[PDB]
Design an enzyme around this catalytic site. Structure first.
Site, PDB file in Angstrom:
ATOM      1  N   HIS A 442       0.831  -1.206   0.000  1.00 42.33           N
ATOM      2  CA  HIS A 442       0.000   0.000   0.000  1.00 42.33           C
ATOM      3  C   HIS A 442       0.869   1.260   0.000  1.00 42.33           C
ATOM      4  O   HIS A 442       0.638   2.182  -0.782  1.00 42.33           O
ATOM      5  CB  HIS A 442      -0.921  -0.043   1.233  1.00 42.33           C
ATOM      6  CG  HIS A 442      -1.628   1.240   1.547  1.00 42.33           C
ATOM      7  ND1 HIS A 442      -2.998   1.312   1.668  1.00 42.33           N
ATOM      8  CD2 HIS A 442      -1.159   2.477   1.843  1.00 42.33           C
ATOM      9  CE1 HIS A 442      -3.345   2.539   2.016  1.00 42.33           C
ATOM     10  NE2 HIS A 442      -2.247   3.268   2.115  1.00 42.33           N
ATOM     11  N   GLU A 443       1.858   1.287   0.891  1.00 41.00           N
ATOM     12  CA  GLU A 443       2.638   2.496   1.119  1.00 41.00           C
ATOM     13  C   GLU A 443       3.678   2.715   0.044  1.00 41.00           C
ATOM     14  O   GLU A 443       3.896   3.852  -0.369  1.00 41.00           O
ATOM     15  CB  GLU A 443       3.304   2.473   2.500  1.00 41.00           C
ATOM     16  CG  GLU A 443       2.305   2.525   3.650  1.00 41.00           C
ATOM     17  CD  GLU A 443       1.567   3.858   3.752  1.00 41.00           C
ATOM     18  OE1 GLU A 443       1.979   4.866   3.109  1.00 41.00           O
ATOM     19  OE2 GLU A 443       0.580   3.898   4.497  1.00 41.00           O
ATOM     20  N   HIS A 447       0.909   4.058  -3.063  1.00 44.50           N
ATOM     21  CA  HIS A 447       1.168   5.497  -3.150  1.00 44.50           C
ATOM     22  C   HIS A 447       2.373   5.875  -4.030  1.00 44.50           C
ATOM     23  O   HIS A 447       2.432   6.989  -4.540  1.00 44.50           O
ATOM     24  CB  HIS A 447       1.344   6.112  -1.761  1.00 44.50           C
ATOM     25  CG  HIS A 447       0.106   6.089  -0.917  1.00 44.50           C
ATOM     26  ND1 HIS A 447      -1.134   6.454  -1.396  1.00 44.50           N
ATOM     27  CD2 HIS A 447      -0.075   5.758   0.382  1.00 44.50           C
ATOM     28  CE1 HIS A 447      -2.026   6.356  -0.424  1.00 44.50           C
ATOM     29  NE2 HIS A 447      -1.408   5.937   0.665  1.00 44.50           N
ATOM     30  N   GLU A 500      -6.577   6.482  -1.313  1.00 40.77           N
ATOM     31  CA  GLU A 500      -6.382   5.397  -0.359  1.00 40.77           C
ATOM     32  C   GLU A 500      -6.979   4.107  -0.926  1.00 40.77           C
ATOM     33  O   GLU A 500      -6.412   3.014  -0.753  1.00 40.77           O
ATOM     34  CB  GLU A 500      -6.998   5.725   1.012  1.00 40.77           C
ATOM     35  CG  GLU A 500      -6.383   6.930   1.721  1.00 40.77           C
ATOM     36  CD  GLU A 500      -4.874   6.806   1.904  1.00 40.77           C
ATOM     37  OE1 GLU A 500      -4.170   7.840   1.894  1.00 40.77           O
ATOM     38  OE2 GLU A 500      -4.379   5.673   2.048  1.00 40.77           O
TER      39      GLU A 500
END
Ligand SMILES: [Cl-]
Ligand SMILES: [Mg+2]
Ligand SMILES: [Mg+2]
Ligand SMILES: [Zn+2]
Length: 718
Positions: A442-443, A447, A500
């Site tokens: 995710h990070e 992103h 997100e």
């Protein structure tokens, strides 16, 4: 609500791997900083209620003379039911975890959920009471009634008849608070490490004392300020020495920590904090905080002092807190491997290579494992310092506390609402590993991926407009960001949620990739279980997310929650039996629901659904197509009571089955020569109690005596 429920959730913080990988020197650094933090967190008792220090002293004596297990037999002999005894343990665990008898979440009093007359039997008949009869009787007389009192002026933190506070003497009003603020402002003196005491003479004239927290008393920059002042017709005195014997312990430990610090930024920040706590100087704490900001990505991270001012009814005085949180070197290594294969991994994503960033930059994400978070509560992230001047000139640290986030959802089998019985054991076993994988993807890849198409003021593009093709049109790009518009500025309402969502969806999509799982240490059946639990957790979290939708405003109150619900909606739309959410009748006869995820269809139905969804998300984001982006996203984010899901009806079920915030048990560290060991406790009220029983092995009784002496000195003020 004014009690903690007997069945309150409990989780234990996991810092095992991270602590093991610390060098001997980093372990000793963390050891002394942790001692500093836990010592200082005791001051929070004095900063909570008049009675809190005595309650702590009394509970501490009780559990030192008898383990929660040895006291159990005593309690039953006094005729407490098992439930009454559990109510006491939960109460004690609550006091310890809040450093006081007010919830740090809500600032409301809590009292023991058993008759005072039964608790008295236990306390006065205890081994502690046998060892010190007059002292224990004295402590019970001092705090027994207040332990139970729900007199309206004690139900909440505040002023006058509206609440209780020990930041100020009991006679203080908001008018007093504002006047003190005006005075401090006029003298360029921070309120953060201060309390306000008001004396009133025979004629009703007020006299004010601003008291600074320091080791030194009223017998550097601070010295010159310790004197009398007249301010708008009011006498003011500035004095220091608040919490002195507790701060002396804090300073001893910070001094020891200096011997093991990693660099000169750490050495200088600690010297400055020592000056701050010794002299009473916020100016010193600011100098230390500047050094702290300059210390980039330390292995052992920490901060300490009078940091947040939420619990001061006026909002300017800080509550003591201290933390030690550590880089997990194994997770660093995994992230580095993920980054090293990012070019290859990015090519697996569902959009064209032209919609990808020209080159991969590792996003600015920092996650640490908490070892110690002392004071009234443990947050799941930090964003500090709070000094506005410093934040502007120097910057700030914005850090995730990964092991606290990892226990945000249920960690106990019996708390797994909405899951099928046959998923519960898997979920408990593989939750931790699946979280680590999801976060990293995710990070870093979430992103860290995706390019915006931009036309600047000169008409120049940041992409090859002659040749880039929108796969949805088959034509050249004809939509792009203009006039210096940004993601956030163009997609005002949904930007944060949609991003997100996109990042979470990258997580679910890439966790299927066997090379990702191998980096995280999983192959075979174990890797399949990590995948399944990641997906299962996501769909359950999307149902739970309905708490944060407001039906009457047709509005989502939290970006991340909305994103999880959207993902659920995408997987439901895919059909084919991949996921179902069915309103059901609970085992107790009340409304319930079941989340059913077919693990055998994750690759065959889930992957292509996310492929299509992600491609759309990125195309619309890259091209700045707000109307297309809003239509897609707001479509999924729509909550209706349409069958078979009946999401509006289910929202009520979600709220019905919602349970209060869990307590968190923290570990201890023990020194033997130059070796430091980690001590861990069971996730239960008894476990949390034991964690505090073992927390101060050298000087627990000395600390309790310090606390009650300080409390007694100020008792006349309330
Ligand atoms: Cl286009
Ligand atoms: Mg009051
Ligand atoms: Mg962890
Ligand atoms: Zn994110």
């Amino acid at each position: 609500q004014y009690i903690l429920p007997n069945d309150i959730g409990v989780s234990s913080l996991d810092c095992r791997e991270a602590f093991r990988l610390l060098s001997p020197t980093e372990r000793l650094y963390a050891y002394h900083l942790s001692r500093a933090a836990w010592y200082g967190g005791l001051a929070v008792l004095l900063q909570t209620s008049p009675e809190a220090p005595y309650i702590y002293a009394l509970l501490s004596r009780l559990f030192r003379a008898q383990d929660p297990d040895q006291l159990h037999q005593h309690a039953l002999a006094e005729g407490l039911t098992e439930e009454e005894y559990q109510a006491f343990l939960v109460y004690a665990a609550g006091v310890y975890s809040n450093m006081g008898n007010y919830k740090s979440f809500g600032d409301t009093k809590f009292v023991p959920n058993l008759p005072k007359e039964k608790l008295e039997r236990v306390i006065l008949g205890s081994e502690a009471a046998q060892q010190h009869p007059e002292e224990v009787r004295g402590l019970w007389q001092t705090c027994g009634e207040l332990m139970f009192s729900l007199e309206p002026r004690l139900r909440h933190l505040g002023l006058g008849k509206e609440g209780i506070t020990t930041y100020f003497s009991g006679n203080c009003t908001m008018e007093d608070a504002k006047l003190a603020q005006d005075f401090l402002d006029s003298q360029n003196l921070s309120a953060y490490n201060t309390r306000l005491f008001k004396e009133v003479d025979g004629e009703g004239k007020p006299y004010y004392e601003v008291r600074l927290a320091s080791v030194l008393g009223s017998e550097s920059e601070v010295t010159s300020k310790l004197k009398s002042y007249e301010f708008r017709g009011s006498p003011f005195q500035v004095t220091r020495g608040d919490y002195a014997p507790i701060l002396q312990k804090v300073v001893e430990q910070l001094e020891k920590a200096k011997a093991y610090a990693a660099n000169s930024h750490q050495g200088q920040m600690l010297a400055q904090y020592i000056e701050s706590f010794t002299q009473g100087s916020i100016e010193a704490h600011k100098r230390g905080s500047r050094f702290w900001i300059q210390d980039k990505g330390p292995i052992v991270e920490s901060y300490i002092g009078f940091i947040e001012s939420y619990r001061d009814p006026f909002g300017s005085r800080g509550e003591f807190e201290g933390f030690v949180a550590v880089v997990n070197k194994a997770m660093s290594a995994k992230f580095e491997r993920l980054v090293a294969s990012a070019e290859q991994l990015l090519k697996e994503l569902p959009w064209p290579p032209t919609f990808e960033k020209d080159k991969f930059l590792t996003p600015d994400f920092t996650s640490l494992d908490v070892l110690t978070f002392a004071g009234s509560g443990i947050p799941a992230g930090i964003n500090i310092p709070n000094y506005d001047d410093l934040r502007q000139t120097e910057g700030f640290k914005n850090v995730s506390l990964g092991n606290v986030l990892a226990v945000a959802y249920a960690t106990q089998r019996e708390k797994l609402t909405f899951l099928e019985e046959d998923d519960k054991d898997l979920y408990i076993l593989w939750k931790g590993p699946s979280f680590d994988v999801q976060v990293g993807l995710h990070e870093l890849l979430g992103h860290g991926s995706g390019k915006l198409f931009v036309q600047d003021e000169k008409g120049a593009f940041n992409f090859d407009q002659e040749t880039v093709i929108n796969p949805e049109t088959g034509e050249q790009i004809q939509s792009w960001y203009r006039s210096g518009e940004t993601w956030d500025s163009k997609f005002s309402t949904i930007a944060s949620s949609y991003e997100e969502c996109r990042a979470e969806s990258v997580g679910l999509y890439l966790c299927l990739h066997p090379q990702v799982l191998e980096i995280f240490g999983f192959e075979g059946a174990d890797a399949e279980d990590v995948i399944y639990v990641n997906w299962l957790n996501m769909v359950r979290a999307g149902l739970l997310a309905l708490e944060f939708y407001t039906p009457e405003a047709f509005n989502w109150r939290q970006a991340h929650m909305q994103a999880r619900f959207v993902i659920l909606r995408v997987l439901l739309e895919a059909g084919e039996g991949l996921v179902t959410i069915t309103p059901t009748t609970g085992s107790d006869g009340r409304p319930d629901a079941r989340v059913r995820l077919d693990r055998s269809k994750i690759r065959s139905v889930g992957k292509p659904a996310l492929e299509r969804f992600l491609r759309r998300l990125q195309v619309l984001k890259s091209t700045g197509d707000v109307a297309g982006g809003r239509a897609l996203y707001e479509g999924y984010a729509t909550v209706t009571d349409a069958p078979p899901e009946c999401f509006l009806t289910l929202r009520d079920t979600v709220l019905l089955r919602k349970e209060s915030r869990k307590l968190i048990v923290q570990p201890n560290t023990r020194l033997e020569g130059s070796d430091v060991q980690l001590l861990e406790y069971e996730a239960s009220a008894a476990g949390l109690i034991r964690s505090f029983s073992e927390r101060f092995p050298e000087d627990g009784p000395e600390l309790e005596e310090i606390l009650t002496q300080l409390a007694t000195a100020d008792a006349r003020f309330w």
